[PDB]
Design a binder for this molecule. Structure first.
Ligand SMILES: [Zn+2]
Length: 58
């Protein structure tokens, strides 16, 4: 049972099966627009499957 890496998110990654638990992240931030990880806002990608600052994102 892993928890979401994003701050202010105590989502339990136990219900999931994979992917979301592999990169440590719930389903919300997984397909969300803005996320808080460490301190700087970012957006989780689907194709690349990894967190990244939303400085260049659309
Ligand atoms: Zn989350």
């Amino acid at each position: 049972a892993i928890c979401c890496q994003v701050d202010n998110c105590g989502a339990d990654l136990s219900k999931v099966k994979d992917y979301h638990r592999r990169h440590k992240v719930c389903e919300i931030h997984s397909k969300a627009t803005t996320a808080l990880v460490g301190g700087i806002m970012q957006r989780f990608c689907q194709q690349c499957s990894r967190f990244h600052v939303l400085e260049e994102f659309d």
